[PDB]
Design a protein around this ligand. Structure first.
Ligand SMILES: COCCOc1ccc2cc1OCC(=O)N(C)CCCN(C)Cc1c[nH]c3ncnc(c13)N2
Length: 351
C-alpha cells in the first residue's frame, strides 16, 4: 500500500499498519496543528505500549520536530535515570517526510481531563500534588540551564487518568476525580538553553509573562509565571487571563495583581501601552468593558478561607510577581509551607 497524506500534510493512518517494521498502530489518541498522536505496540520490545507523535509532512514542522528531537537527546543525557518527571523519547525516525517520535504511553492531559469533567476544578489536595511535581520537574531543567517556554495544561499529562465518579457535595451534578495525581511534563520543542538564541516572543498567550509582552528579555522566570497561571486554572477550572491581545492582557494583569512596577515601564520600548506613566486603554470598548466586568483582585478567587487555601494563594501571588528578578524561583517554591500538606507518599514520589 502507498503512503498517503491529506490536504494539510497529515499522514493517513490505519489501524493494523506498521512503521519501521516495528510499530503496529492500535489506536488514535489525538490531533493538533503539528500532526497526530497514535497509540502503537512496539514489536521489537515485547509489544510494549507507545504513543507515537507523527508530524505533518510540511517543511517547517519537520524542522521543528528535528529541533525537539535534539532537545530531547540533551535532556536524557542529564537525566539518564529518568527521575525528574519529563516525557523523554525512546526512538525517532523520518517516515517518508513525517518525523515520528516515540514516547511512553500516558493518560489524558490535564486540560482534557478538566474539559471531560465539564470544567469543574481539581480539589485542593490534587492541585497541591500537581504543583509539587511541576516545581520539581522544572527546577531540574532550570538548574541545567534550560527554560521550557511553553508550559500549559495541555502538555502536562497524567500517568494514568482513570477516575471515580462521585456526586458533587454542593451541586446538582456528578464529578470525576482522578485516582492517581502523578503527572509528567511534555513538549520540549521550544525549550531553550541559556546559550542559545532567545526569540522576542515566547509562550502561549494566556501563559505569557509581562517581561515578554514588554520585550524586556526572558529566562527561567518565564516558566514560573506560566506555573502560577496553570495552578489557578486547575483550582478554578477557568483561565486566569482569557485574552487575545497585549493591551488587554496588561490591563487584566493590573486589575488582578496590582500596578505594573514603574521601573519596568521606564525600561520598555513598548511605550504604546502607556500614557503619563500608566496603562492607557479604552474603557468603553468591548475589551475594556469585558475586563472591567470580569477581572477582579487575585484573592477574590479563593473558594475557602482555611489555611491551605490562603497558602496556595500566597504561593500563586509570588509566582505571579511582575518583576522576573523578584519572582519566586522553583527552588524557593519547594520550600513554601503550602507543601506541608502533602502526604508522605506524595512528598517522596511513591505515587
Ligand atoms: C486531540 O484532542 C484531545 C487529545 O489530545 C492529545 C492526545 C494525546 C496527547 C496529547 C494531546 O493533546 C496535547 C498535544 O497534542 N501535545 C501536548 C503534543 C503531543 C504530546 N504527546 C505526544 C505527549 C505524549 C507522550 N505520551 C503520551 N501518551 C498519551 N497521550 C499523549 C502523550 N499525548
Amino acid at each position: 500500500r502507498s503512503v498517503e497524506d491529506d490536504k494539510e500534510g497529515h499522514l493517513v493512518c490505519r489501524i493494523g499498519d506498521w512503521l519501521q517494521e516495528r510499530y503496529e498502530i492500535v489506536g488514535n489518541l489525538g490531533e493538533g496543528t503539528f500532526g497526530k498522536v497514535v497509540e502503537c505496540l512496539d514489536h521489537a520490545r515485547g509489544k510494549s505500549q507507545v504513543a507515537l507523535k507523527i508530524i505533518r509532512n510540511v517543511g517547517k514542522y519537520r524542522e521543528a520536530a528535528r529541533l525537539e528531537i535534539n532537545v530531547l537527546k540533551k535532556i536524557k543525557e542529564k537525566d539518564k535515570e529518568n527521575k525528574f518527571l519529563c516525557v523523554l523519547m525512546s526512538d525517532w525516525f523520518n517516515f517518508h517526510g513525517h518525523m515520528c517520535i516515540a514516547f511512553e504511553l500516558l493518560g489524558k492531559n490535564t486540560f482534557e481531563f478538566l474539559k471531560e469533567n465539564n470544567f469543574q476544578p481539581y480539589p485542593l489536595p490534587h492541585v497541591r500534588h500537581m504543583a509539587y511535581q511541576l516545581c520539581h520537574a522544572l527546577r531540574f531543567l532550570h538548574e541545567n540551564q534550560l527554560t521550557h517556554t511553553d508550559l500549559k495544561p495541555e502538555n502536562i499529562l497524567f500517568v494514568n487518568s482513570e477516575f471515580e465518579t462521585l456526586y458533587n457535595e454542593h451541586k446538582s451534578c456528578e464529578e470525576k476525580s482522578v485516582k492517581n495525581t502523578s503527572i509528567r511534563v511534555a513538549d520540549f520543542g521550544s525549550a531553550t538553553f541559556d546559550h542559545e538564541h532567545h526569540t522576542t516572543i515566547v509562550a502561549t498567550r494566556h501563559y505569557r509573562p509581562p517581561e515578554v509582552i514588554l520585550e524586556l528579555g526572558w529566562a527561567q522566570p518565564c516558566d514560573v509565571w506560566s506555573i502560577g497561571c496553570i495552578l489557578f486554572e486547575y483550582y478554578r477550572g477557568f483561565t486566569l487571563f482569557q485574552t487575545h491581545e497585549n493591551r488587554e492582557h496588561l490591563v487584566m494583569m493590573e486589575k488582578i495583581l496590582g500596578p505594573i512596577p514603574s521601573h519596568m515601564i521606564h525600561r520598555t520600548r513598548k511605550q504604546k501601552y502607556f500614557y503619563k506613566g500608566g496603562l492607557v486603554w479604552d474603557e468603553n470598548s468591548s475589551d475594556g468593558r469585558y475586563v472591567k466586568e470580569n477581572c477582579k483582585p487575585l484573592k477574590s478567587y479563593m473558594l475557602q478561607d482555611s489555611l491551605e487555601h490562603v497558602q496556595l494563594f500566597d504561593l500563586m501571588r509570588r509566582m505571579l510577581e511582575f518583576d522576573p528578578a523578584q519572582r519566586i524561583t522553583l527552588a524557593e517554591a519547594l520550600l513554601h509551607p503550602f507543601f506541608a500538606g502533602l502526604t508522605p507518599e506524595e512528598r517522596s514520589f511513591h505515587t
